[PDB]
Ligand binder design. Structure first.
Ligand code: HEM
Ligand code: HEM
Ligand code: HEM
Ligand code: HEM
Ligand SMILES: OC[C@H]1O[C@H](O)[C@H](O)[C@@H](O)[C@@H]1O
Ligand SMILES: OC[C@H]1O[C@H](O)[C@H](O)[C@@H](O)[C@@H]1O
Ligand SMILES: OC[C@H]1O[C@](O)(CO)[C@@H](O)[C@@H]1O
Lengths: 146, 141, 141, 146
């Protein structure tokens, strides 16, 4: 992912101000609610039956943190996304057989969530740069299909 | 296909747009051009400088159509019949672009109205935006 | 959204399926399972070998449900509600899978009924099948 | 694209029977009919107002055998797809900005046309092997977006 070095740090900047214990869980939780067929990869998670049941589920928040961390790994190494997500790519593609359209959906709900949490500070130039980062994660995760 | 509870969420949440409609459809457009430069193809002569009056005008037309789509949610094929004419028959817009705009519409609703944008309302808005896109990229007349 | 001319092409071509319904349904299914083995994960309880009695039986119900949908083309949401509940609510089917079966239903219809598989009919059939998939993948209860 | 020895012979065997002058124009033509938003890329071709205007177009037909020819260079070197399609990748991605979902749809309409011509010769295992080639062509054509 090629960012104008403005971009590179306008993104680092929003990400330190990210509640690391709560935004993965909201992004993961909105995926399962907005795209309900995604709950199939997560049947081991118990109660997933209403938005409120999904959003307050402890397994969702726990897993949302591990997802967000993988993203944090991504922002750190924007020049090597395919080496960072190679282990994850194999997991999501070869074992879990997740259709890669879903990678893109998650990354865009993460954008709707960052926008939710920062409002007027998540501006078009700021989105624009996150769209490239999140396209890059999805591409890198989908590498085992390419 | 939208549920009875989808229509409620959409009607309720979209109704809070009001005077901000042309502001919101304009920002949504700007998010789309910045984030997705490929959409610029369809607007080759637009002025797209940040505050361009062309973009605010068009921003208003886009929002007022959605406001009217909500009013006719069970009758959109016939309600937006001419908008299909434009987008599907004449412009021949690739349906991928409808997803990219719908998403930017959702980012603009979350950044401005966080209290409306619950998970349930998010799902409903997403579905409602997909249903309008199907009408505008379809040919059925 | 289907055109008048779309409804007519589908009736005209599905109508000619007749007694081969379950043969085509089960060929379509086999086509799906061999072309895209990820789809198999939805049928862990089936024997999915070429000769399979379950595949042939399930082949029948899909095809008959499609005839059912041709007959109510003007409002499938109601005709296919138990099917929508099953696929969207209970099985949680990834809608990519509906694109895969649909493609395999057109491959079968091309190979068996080539005098009917004109571009116009092809176009209508593709639109029809997408309408069905949209219905079976949505929660509108 | 990793095919078996018999998948490879089954593919080679069916292609030899393909009319190089006609199948690609018939594939391109149904693309334009089944997915009308694709006509926007071929506005210099002339009349595409009706299905019979599309299928009886000498431009669609002439461009079709160009598409088919590139699929043919595909089958000839399935170990070198990315590079067979490197020049075309850049044209379709960087000059033309064709959404890669359209690459997948053209591959499928060609399968539909292969089925239509070869009927019951176009068997489940033969389709399966062609879906591999066709996803390989579309993935290689899309390489500039990765
Ligand atoms: C696009 C961004 C995504 C990121 C950054 C991400 C990240 C992660 C990480 C770090 C793990 C833990 C891996 C481990 O501990 O070995 C994981 C596990 C998993 N992910 Fe992903 N993921 C993404 C997308 C998805 C999507 C879209 C789905 C399904 C719709 C999915 C389904 C799963 C499943 C089923 C597991 C492990 C199963 C379980 O713990 O129950 N992931 N993901
Ligand atoms: C939510 C979906 C959309 C809605 C509700 C919408 C609404 C409208 C309306 C109402 C008009 C015509 C204004 C008038 O004459 O009254 C219009 C025109 C137009 N739309 Fe859309 N639109 C949507 C999506 C898109 C997308 C995704 C694109 C492509 C990126 C697009 C490209 C255009 C273009 C090029 C025009 C004509 C602009 C001109 O005057 O040159 N639209 N839209
Ligand atoms: C053309 C669109 C489809 C139609 C018309 C259709 C129709 C049906 C019908 C009639 C049944 C029988 C259920 C009953 O008797 O209560 C069924 C069940 C089922 N469907 Fe679908 N279906 C479609 C697409 C799909 C897809 C894409 C998948 C996933 C790959 C899928 C997975 C299943 C499964 C696992 C069952 C239950 C099988 C069993 O336990 O016997 N269907 N569907
Ligand atoms: C996925 C399989 C495809 C293959 C193998 C393919 C192959 C080709 C080839 C060989 C050329 C000619 C290059 C030359 O000038 O020597 C070409 C040009 C072109 N292709 Fe594709 N193509 C594919 C899909 C598509 C799609 C989906 C579209 C648009 C919907 C498209 C639009 C075009 C356009 C607009 C040109 C330039 C034609 C002109 O001069 O107006 N192609 N392609
Ligand atoms: O002639 C075509 C031109 O006129 C139309 O009215 C459009 O509004 C304009 O943007 C377009 O370039
Ligand atoms: O990776 C970025 C690319 O994503 C999508 O495929 C767009 O449709 C394409 O035009 C864009 O350049
Ligand atoms: O319209 C194109 C879009 O369709 C799917 O919804 C099919 C996506 O894979 C793709 O982005």
């Amino acid at each position: 992912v090629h960012l104008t070095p403005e971009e590179k740090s306008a993104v680092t900047a929003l990400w330190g101000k990210v509640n690391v214990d709560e935004v993965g869980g909201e992004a993961l939780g909105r995926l399962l609610v907005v795209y309900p067929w995604t709950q199939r990869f997560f049947e081991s998670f118990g109660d997933l039956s209403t938005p409120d049941a999904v959003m307050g589920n402890p397994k969702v928040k726990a897993h949302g943190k591990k997802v967000l961390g993988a993203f944090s790994d991504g922002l750190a190494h924007l020049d090597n996304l395919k080496g960072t997500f190679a282990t994850l790519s194999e997991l999501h593609c070869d074992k879990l057989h997740v259709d890669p359209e879903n990678f893109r959906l998650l990354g865009n709900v993460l954008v709707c969530v960052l926008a939710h949490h920062f409002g007027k500070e998540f501006t078009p130039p700021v989105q624009a740069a996150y769209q490239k980062v999140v396209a890059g994660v999805a591409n890198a995760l989908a590498h085992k299909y390419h | 296909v939208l549920s009875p509870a989808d229509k409620t969420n959409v009607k309720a949440a979209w109704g809070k747009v009001g005077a901000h409609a042309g502001e919101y459809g304009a920002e949504a457009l700007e998010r789309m051009f910045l984030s997705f430069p490929t959409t610029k193809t369809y607007f080759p002569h637009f002025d797209l400088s940040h505050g361009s009056a062309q973009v605010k005008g068009h921003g208003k037309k886009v929002a007022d159509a959605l406001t009217n789509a909500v009013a006719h949610v069970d009758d959109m094929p016939n309600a937006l019949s001419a908008l299909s004419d434009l987008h599907a028959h004449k412009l021949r817009v690739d349906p991928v672009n409808f997803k990219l705009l719908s998403h930017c519409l959702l980012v603009t609703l979350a950044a401005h109205l966080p209290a409306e944008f619950t998970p349930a309302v998010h799902a409903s808005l997403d579905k409602f935006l997909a249903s309008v896109s199907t009408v505008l990229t379809s040919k059925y007349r």
